[PDB]
Symmetry: C3
Subunit: 304 residues, 3 copies
Amino acid sequence: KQTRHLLTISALCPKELAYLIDRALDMKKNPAKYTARAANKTLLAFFAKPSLRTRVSLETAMTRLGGHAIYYELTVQDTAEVFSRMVDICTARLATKEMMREMAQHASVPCINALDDFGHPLQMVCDFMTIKEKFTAAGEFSNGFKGIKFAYCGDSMNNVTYDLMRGCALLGMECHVCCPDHKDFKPIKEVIDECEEIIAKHGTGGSIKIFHDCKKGCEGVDVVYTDSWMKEARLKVLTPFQVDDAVMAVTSKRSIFMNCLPATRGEEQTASVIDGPKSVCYDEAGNRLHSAMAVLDFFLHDCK
Amino acid sequence: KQTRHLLTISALCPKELAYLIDRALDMKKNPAKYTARAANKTLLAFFAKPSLRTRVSLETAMTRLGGHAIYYELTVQDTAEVFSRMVDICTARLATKEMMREMAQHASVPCINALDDFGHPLQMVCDFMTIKEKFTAAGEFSNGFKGIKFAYCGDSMNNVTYDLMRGCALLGMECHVCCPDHKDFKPIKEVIDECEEIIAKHGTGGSIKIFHDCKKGCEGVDVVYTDSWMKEARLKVLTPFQVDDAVMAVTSKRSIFMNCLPATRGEEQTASVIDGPKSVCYDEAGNRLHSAMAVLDFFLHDCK
Amino acid sequence: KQTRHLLTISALCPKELAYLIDRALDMKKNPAKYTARAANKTLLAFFAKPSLRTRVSLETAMTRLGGHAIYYELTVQDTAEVFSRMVDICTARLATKEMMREMAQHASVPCINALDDFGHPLQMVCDFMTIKEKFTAAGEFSNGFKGIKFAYCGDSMNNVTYDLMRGCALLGMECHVCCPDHKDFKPIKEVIDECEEIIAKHGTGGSIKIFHDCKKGCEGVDVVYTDSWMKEARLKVLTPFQVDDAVMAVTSKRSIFMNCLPATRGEEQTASVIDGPKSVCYDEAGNRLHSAMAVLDFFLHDCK
Ligand code: NI
């Protein structure tokens, strides 16, 4: 209460998200500067289920800043009341947004959702950082994020899709959500409404469009992003949304391909796309590190 | 052998316990001074069962001192012989005092009992530190610990009660143990004898009194402390020892209420006491951190 | 690919192994010098099964160098591709040489085998360091490793025996392998061939001899080393290779006894040998620490 949390990426205003991106980018390039930013400070990091990516980037981020992360494998008020008088910051990877919200409710140090059924803001700072990084080096970033057309393909009733839509809205991107015309695979109306309100409120110039044909949705786009599809006959509804060569063939000449991982080479995309030349997946996953250092640093302090 | 351990709080003489309290208090207030006290030094921390409180305070304490704790989740001679040539200090949370004593026997670095069936000295430095802190800020500490009347309510055949009785004896406090007149719920004679001997030997001016009526036991007292009661018909014997509003109504006007946690709101106390205005429980649990830094620091060196 | 790994000790040329030994020895004696060698740098440490020795020495080594180890309890390409853009170095304790080789294949930071079915190079730097240390203090090291006759007793189809044979070949020692004349308990021909080739290629002056009588094999030797034998009637084949008092009575007057641990007092050796006066086992196990700091430091950089 009055402590700032990060339960979704829209916990940030547009300039805060753009500051975090640039800070991540400067910590990537100039780590020697940040080497004592969290000296003697600790992050308490709950995981209800392992994620190599999340755990290694978090634990490494703190070492690079000169502090330490407690890997804590799994009353909540009492727990939160008690850790907030010991640790400086907390991330938690819990099943539902409920447990995450409950913990944050009573916590008096910043709490960061390290993935739940409603968002994944650590990934969001990672991905938009990767997009700025990639396009800037190719000299395609004169128009900033504004000119980068983004498409998400696949199961779109999805915490990752929710948070990408929010990042795009915040950053003023054209976001296309390419999903099966099926109630169980589309973004939730609440999430669309949040996005259209944040673009309205900040006049970001962003837009949200829902396509039910990935090729039509991906025509002209600069980023194609997909993620894990995981009786298993979601496959019949999802298969037309596999990112393949014909899908990538309709995108811009500058396009890049992203997937937050774990990747399954014959589900959400073909091995030829992920292992092909438009794929930024591994550099994107490494960027979890630098985007984590930026987020922790910022919540450890708060400004700028 | 010839290495100093901390298996109970009476491993310390009265001035060492009072030094640890003041060091904890100064590390609370002035952490910047202690920031390199354990630089490059590691604590090996065994847990046979998780305790969020114990683990987070230990791991955080070392970071704050600039060192590191190995969270080690679970021959003992060979183990201890081997870790004593690698690590600088060791804490262990093991089932019985036996395993703890065995490990310490062969260990050649300091070993600290992080909770067993016979004591909890890390909690003891925490609690007496909290008592000094609270009463000092209220201006009720002119007579030091000497004037603070202390009462423990509940199941008193209990490692926590044992170690509170020892802390009180050491510090020269009037300690009242409020328990059911029942062989299975009273302090053990060995523990009473140790306490009466330490007060005798140091002329501490402390006293130990056993009451079988918590209200009678708590009349006039300045601290009321209870802890977890956990077929489950210990409840019929324990219920007259619940710390409720009528119990707290007989204590001093300055009194405070303590519980080392986990708290169960309708067992050892009512929700109105723990969530009411005399409760110091959460600040007390946070003080695990600073009392841990003091204990580790001291055993890492030894003097003063 | 083009990243240097350490999957066996023969990943090192003879001078690199001798440099690591001397560095370990200088870090033992002068730790204050090495206190910022891994500042802000992290080691990712996978364990498919706990080893107190391996885990504590690794985690402590990094703290002493000023960095941090992630204890990671257990696609491999994707995993390795991803951790190589976050962490600085990796050790892994995996079942087979296969998984270890697979991980290393795709990894772009140094990977170190922390024990598999084919080697144990962290132990190797430990043991030869212990041998140099012990004999140097006794003034028995004028002839360096060259004059120290080494014998391994026991089950010799063994990753530890493999890597000792390699260390000896590298260092130019007479190595005697004392094993049961039984296909399942002898070194593998591939390992003998590697050793005879490394001595040939570097003209180390080392030799490999296979004895089927431990007393005959140990006659005159300066080091007797054994390790864990673990329906359980391997005991009938192994029992003539128990290191007992009559075995140690045939060695040099300067001899020492080694066992990498865990020790079972009535299997691979008698309690009188391991607890007797020739035993260096515990100082040897503590030396895991300093030999770990040397190996990590070296792979973190690479030269000298
Ligand atoms: Ni750690």
